[PDB]
Structure formats: C-alpha cells, structure tokens
C-alpha cells in the first residue's frame, strides 16, 4: 500500500531533453532507497547533505525526481558548485543541495545507427540558470551588437542544439540517463518515509 513509484521514474520509456527536464513529485508513499542504492545498474549514485546508506531511516515532506538525458562526460556537472554548458544553461543544482544524483549509461536505449538526434540541450544563454530553474524558451541568441530580425542574421544563433548519439561513440559521448532526487524538509507533516519509519 503506497510504495513510492520509482519504477515509473527510473524505468520510464521516454526521458526528457535536459533543457526541458522532467519533474515528478513523489508524495504519500514509502520509499526503499536501499533497493536502488544496491544496484549493479547505476554508474553514479552520489548524495549530498544526506548519507546514502541511512536513507531508509529518514522522513521528508516532499521528494522530487528530475530526469533527463545528457552526455557521459557531462554527468560531473549535475552536482553542486559545478559550471559548464549543462550546469549553467540547462540544469543547476544549488550549493545547499540535499538529495541524490543517479545516472546510468543508456547507450543501448538512446543511441541509434546513423545517430539519434532527438535529445537537445541549450548551448547559448544570456546568463546562468538559478538552481532548479528550467528554460524552454527559443528566442534567437544575439552574440554581436547587430540585432537578429529577418534580414540580419550575423552573430545570431538558435539557442538549442541536438545531441548526436551513435552507438560507436566513446563513453564520454554516449547518452546517460539521470535522476536527481530532491529530499525537501518543510515545517510540515512528512509524506515520504523510509521503511524503517513507516508509522509516519
């Protein structure tokens, strides 16, 4: 009765582009974090502000699950205090992040011979994202001093680019699926508890 639906998140068929990252609220359910944490599945499992092992002993007000695909060598940017194209322009974790970043190689699912180009990322932006901000706008990015209208297009750029995932790419270029679990602690009744603390 009301076990948290992590399978809906981790085993989801479709994953979002990182610039349009998907959020799922996790509420009113028990969560065995240790079933995930003890998985040969995951290549990254890093927690911040919380101990990965004692997760089953904690309660939280709300838990959020952000999910998206990025390049293998961009996983290091899904962490507090990072910079780079993903951290600055796509998905930004705050310095005081409490939660876990989970990632696994999805070359088998998200690559394709000739290349899968259906995943995008923001390449250009006037400024950096604030933590947990999402920008899905598509205004032309102006890098010069001349404007971007309908005759002048010099030093102007469409802001989103496609990843290109071919199965033969090296590990750093292969697609990785990412789930960021946010453990939120309000002054309010908990709704998500480990198995150890199941009597709310």
């Amino acid at each position: 009765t009301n076990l948290c639906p992590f399978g809906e998140v981790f085993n989801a068929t479709r994953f979002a582009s990182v610039y349009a990252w998907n959020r799922k609220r996790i509420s009113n359910c028990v969560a065995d974090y240790s079933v995930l944490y003890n998985s040969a599945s995951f290549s990254t499992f890093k927690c911040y502000g919380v101990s990965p092992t004692k997760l089953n002993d904690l309660c939280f007000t709300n838990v959020y699950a952000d999910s998206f695909v990025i390049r293998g060598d961009e996983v290091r940017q899904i962490a507090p205090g990072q910079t780079g194209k993903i951290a600055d322009y796509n998905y930004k974790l705050p310095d005081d992040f409490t939660g876990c970043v989970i990632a696994w190689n999805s070359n088998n699912l998200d690559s394709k011979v000739g290349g899968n180009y259906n995943y995008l990322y923001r390449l250009f932006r006037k400024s950096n994202l604030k933590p947990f901000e999402r920008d899905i706008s598509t205004e032309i990015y102006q890098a010069g001093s001349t404007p971007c209208n309908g005759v002048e297009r010099f030093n102007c750029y469409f802001p989103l680019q496609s990843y290109g995932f071919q199965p033969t790419n090296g590990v750093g270029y292969q697609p990785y699926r990412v789930v960021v679990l946010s453990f939120e602690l309000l002054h309010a009744p908990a709704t998500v508890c480990g198995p150890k603390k199941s009597e709310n």
Binding site: F124, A143, G144, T168, Q174
Partner: protein, 596 residues
C-alpha cells in the same frame, strides 16, 4: 561584446557541428576501408563531400573575425586553421588547371611502366616490378636499366608538368602571403606571438642545415664502410674515393640503404634476433599482440584501450567475408571513438607495428579534450616520432625477455648489437642526407634560385656534394629525376622525415633519462617507468594548442631540434665504424663518375 567573445561563440557552434559531421565521414570511410564495395565508395565520397563543403562555409564565416582583435591564443589558433585559403586564392581556371596537372602527374607515376628493350611485351611497373629489381638484383647492368628506364620514361613525361606545377603552386603561395611554395610548406613549423617560443619559417632552413653539419661525420663513416663493402659486390664499378653510383643503393632512389644489409652486414654469422618463431610456438594471435601493447602503455601510466577500441577495431584480415584495406592505420574518428585497422600476422614485425600504431592511439586519446581543430600532433613530425619510440623499447632484448619471447638465459653479444645498429643506420641515417638534399633542391627551385636549364645539373651536383651519390649516366634537362619519386610527383612535403627522425631520438633520450636507464641508449626500455610516461603525456595532451617548441620542451627540456641524441644512439656504431675505416678513404671526391 568584443570581436574575441563573438569569435568564441562562433567557435562553440563550429565545434559542436564539426565533431558530428567529421564523425559521419569517419564512419563512412571506416566502412569502405574495412568492407570494400561500390556502395561504400559512394557513402565515403558523399560524406567526404559534405565535410569539405561544411569546412568551406565555416572558413568563409570565420573570415569575419580579424586576428588583430584576438588576444586569446587558443582562439587565434582555431581561427587561423579555419581561415586558411589554400587553392581558393586561385582563379577557377587556374585552380582547375593545377588540379589537372596534379592528377596527371599522379597517374603518370602510378601507371608508369617500362618494357624490355629486346621484348616490347615483357614490361614492368615500379611496383612490384622495378622495386623488386632495385631491392634484390646484384647485376650492375640490370639495376642500371631499371634505374635509367624509370627516369627516362616516367621522368621525361613529368618534366613539362612539374615546371607548370611550380608556377601555379608559387602563385597560390604568394596569394596566401608566402614568398613561394617552399615558404608555404615551412609554415607548418611557424610560431608567432608566444614570447620565447616563436619560430620563423626561415629558421627551419638553418636549423636543418646546422643539425645536418653535425650528422656529417657519422654519415661519412657509414658511407665509406658501405662503399668498401660495395666494391666487393661490384668489383670494377666503384671508386674508393668517389661517390656511390645511384643505382646500387637497394631501392629506386637510394631513399634508404636498408636493402644493402646483405652486402654490408658486419658479422654475417650472427643471426638477428627475431621472436617470430617463439610467438608461433607460444600460440600468440592478433589479440594477444595488442593486449601486450596495451600492457606496455599501462606500465608507464597511460590508460587502457577503450571498450570501443576492442569492439570496433579490425585487428585481423577479414578474409573470406569482406575485402579490407590492410595498411596499418590508427584511426581517431572523434566523439571518443578510437580504432586500429590492421591485418595482423603473428610476426615480430607486426608485434612491433602494433606498439607503433597504438602509440598513435595514445596520442589521440590524450589530446581528445583539446578543442576540435587543436587535436593533432604539435607539428607534422610529432605523431610518427611518438609511434617510432614505441618500437624502440619494444624490440630491445631486455623487453622481449620480460614478456617471455626470449629465454631468461639469453645474452646480447658485441657482434649482434653492431649488426643491429648498422642495420638501423642504413635505414635511419642513410635517409637523412637524401631527405635534406631533396627538400633543399625543391626549396631552391620554388625560390627561383635554380633556373630551369640547370634543374638536373644542380640536382646531380647536390646529390654528389651532399649525399655522396653520383648519376651512373649523364642526364640533360629533359629529365625530371626528383619527380621520379612518389612524394615529388604527388605533391607531399618531405622535410617531415628529417625532423621526425631527430625528434624520435630526442624523445627517447629524455624518456630513458627519466626511466634512469643505464648503458648505451639503443638498449633502453621505458616499460614500468611512470616518470617516463608522465613526461610523454605532458606533451601528448597538448595536441596542437601550444607551440611545437613548447611541446618539445615539455619532453626534452629544450626548445630546439637537436641531433645529438640521434648521434648518441649510434655512438657504439660510430666508434666501431671509425676503426673499420682506418685503412680507407673517408669522404668522397665529386670529380669521379662512372661515365668519365
């Protein structure tokens, strides 16, 4: 926003789009080279056409960021590589013309064939026909007929085209702001705007010339030793004080003296060390060979091959399934995808090649994090120098003992080592005057310092003067003997073989210094030395982002090409050669010729 930060935004967009498009062409080309079919030819050319067209447009766009306004030298370098114009400076009538000259010269060479004067039906091509004569024949007249027929039948065809080629190429170079086509080629070594590491195009001529002066003693002594041995093999045909006849040198040009080993081996009773039989006894296959090469790089602190390397490489001839192109090649496709294509056989030769080729892969992997256009050797001589030092370590008896291809109770004697160093020098040292002299003739022709009616006169004057080699029959200006060699008639610069050769021993000396090697340099194995691996890696990872003078200084502690490490490698042979020549003339007189 400044022109520089506009240029960096343009480069961000260039890099993302370039890497994927280059990758697709790399894939198509891979598919052809591993599976020859008409269909895959088409894919390869389609993808290569798209890549070329993309580079043409990007070059046009990059032209809008003037170099004046760029401080950041990592940005300036990328822009520099993008706004090079090459043959596009020419009109399209001239550009179409020079391409025709190029393609005619190339086809005249690869289809050139000579026929028995008696029988107009027994004909030979350069490969395998003439080369086989020039490599194995001991008959003065037959070697002479092959040497002369090639140059008179193919060379005379090339002569009018090469003169025109010089004019157009020089025009291109001037419209690209170079003095002439030679100055254009020396640009690969140029460094500007990096304080204390700059290097001018003209300095290459002097540094080549100064380093050659220090190779002359070793060369002269090798020459005199070979000359005495050749008098035994061709009794009435060679003066003990004159130049070596050009058709007796073991290949069509004397480019290497490799195939004189049988005639000049110091100690014919001592067989060379060849672990081919041992590898067959121990049931080695191609996989084992490349696993051993992988072990060698890890032992010095370098990474393993990637998982993709093992899944996607072609390490053996696919034989009855597909047709493949079997030249050993190290492929850097981009996007973390590194491969080797090699039809490996279970021989000592292929064991050593695998180390060589995998050294290219190590270079490629170390500089993958550099921006796209900076992923390359620090100049045209670096990659091959990295590959060659890997064969050096891997062929030493010390190394082969360690891996169980020589018995733990094996010992190197004086005579085998001298045999080895002599063989080495015939290839490595013998090509250096050849390579220098040939390029000097081209640099001077491109500068307009040799008038057309003296092309062959000055060619053979410089052969006699610098190389110690004399034409067996006189040749007038209807000949174009330099174009009788692939690189000349196919438009490839040649000094790279000189600079790379010096680099490789500079690298080895420094790396062996770091591994605390003791004894003669030629015996050094850098395995298990992470201090040597780290010194190499500090240069490898630079790719093309730094001056080659700095990349060199990272390995060897100096900024200059330097022949002393080469001379060091050969020191035991030098002293030995000096003793052998004690009753001989050392040097030569230009005055003697076989036809005087």
């Amino acid at each position: 926003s400044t022109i520089e930060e506009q240029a960096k935004t343009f480069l961000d967009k260039f890099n993302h789009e370039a890497e994927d498009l280059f990758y697709q062409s790399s894939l198509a080309s891979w598919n052809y080279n591993t599976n020859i079919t008409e269909e895959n030819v088409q894919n390869m050319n389609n993808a290569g056409d798209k890549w070329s067209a993309f580079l043409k447009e990007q070059s046009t766009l990059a032209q809008m960021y003037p170099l004046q306004e760029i401080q950041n030298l990592t940005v300036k370098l990328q822009l520099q590589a993008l706004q090079q114009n090459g043959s596009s400076v020419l009109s399209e009538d001239k550009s179409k013309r020079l391409n025709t000259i190029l393609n005619t010269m190339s086809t005249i060479y690869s289809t050139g064939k000579v026929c028995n004067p008696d029988n107009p039906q027994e004909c030979l091509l350069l490969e395998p026909g003439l080369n086989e004569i020039m490599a194995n024949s001991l008959d003065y007249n037959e070697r002479l007929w092959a040497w002369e027929s090639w140059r008179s039948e193919v060379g005379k065809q090339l002569r009018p085209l090469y003169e025109e080629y010089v004019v157009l190429k020089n025009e291109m170079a001037r419209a690209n702001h170079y003095e002439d086509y030679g100055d254009y080629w020396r640009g690969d070594y140029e460094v500007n705007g990096v304080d204390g590491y700059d290097y001018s195009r003209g300095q290459l001529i002097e540094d080549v010339e100064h380093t050659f002066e220090e190779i002359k003693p070793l060369y002269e002594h090798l020459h005199a030793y070979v000359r005495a041995k050749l008098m035994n093999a061709y009794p009435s045909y060679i003066s003990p004080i004159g130049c070596l006849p050009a058709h007796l040198l073991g290949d069509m040009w004397g480019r290497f003296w490799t195939n004189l080993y049988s005639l000049t081996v110091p100690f014919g009773q001592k067989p060379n060390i060849d672990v081919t039989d041992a590898m067959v006894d121990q049931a080695w296959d191609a996989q084992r060979i490349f696993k051993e090469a992988e072990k060698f790089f890890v032992s010095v602190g370098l990474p393993n091959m990637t998982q993709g390397f093992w899944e996607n490489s072609m390490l053996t001839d696919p034989g009855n399934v597909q047709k493949a192109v079997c030249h050993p090649t190290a492929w850097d496709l981009g996007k973390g995808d590194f491969r080797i294509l090699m039809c490996t056989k279970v021989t000592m030769d292929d064991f050593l090649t695998a180390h060589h080729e995998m050294g290219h892969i190590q270079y490629d992997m170390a500089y993958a994090a550099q921006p796209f256009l900076l992923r390359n050797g620090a100049n045209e001589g670096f990659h091959e120098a990295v590959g060659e030092i890997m064969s050096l370590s891997a062929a030493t008896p010390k190394h082969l003992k360690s891996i169980g291809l020589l018995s733990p109770d094996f010992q190197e004697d004086n005579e085998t080592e001298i045999n080895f160093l002599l063989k080495q020098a015939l290839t490595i040292v013998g090509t250096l005057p050849f390579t220098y002299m040939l390029e000097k003739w081209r640099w001077m022709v491109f500068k307009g310092e040799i008038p057309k009616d003296q092309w062959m006169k000055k060619w053979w004057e410089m052969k006699r003067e610098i190389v110690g080699v004399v034409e067996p029959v006189p040749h007038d200006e209807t000949y174009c003997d330099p174009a009788s060699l692939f690189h000349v008639s196919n438009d490839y610069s040649f000094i790279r073989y000189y600079t790379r050769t010096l680099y490789q021993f500079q690298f080895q000396e420094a790396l062996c210094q770091a591994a605390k090697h003791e004894g003669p340099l030629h015996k050094c194995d850098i395995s298990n030395s992470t201090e040597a691996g780290q010194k190499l890696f500090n240069m490898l990872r630079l790719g093309k982002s730094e001056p080659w003078t700095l990349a060199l200084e990272n390995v060897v502690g100096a900024k200059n090409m330097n022949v002393r490490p080469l001379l060091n490698y050969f020191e035991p042979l030098f002293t030995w050669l000096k003793d052998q020549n004690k009753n001989s003339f050392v040097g030569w007189s230009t005055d003697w010729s076989p036809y005087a």
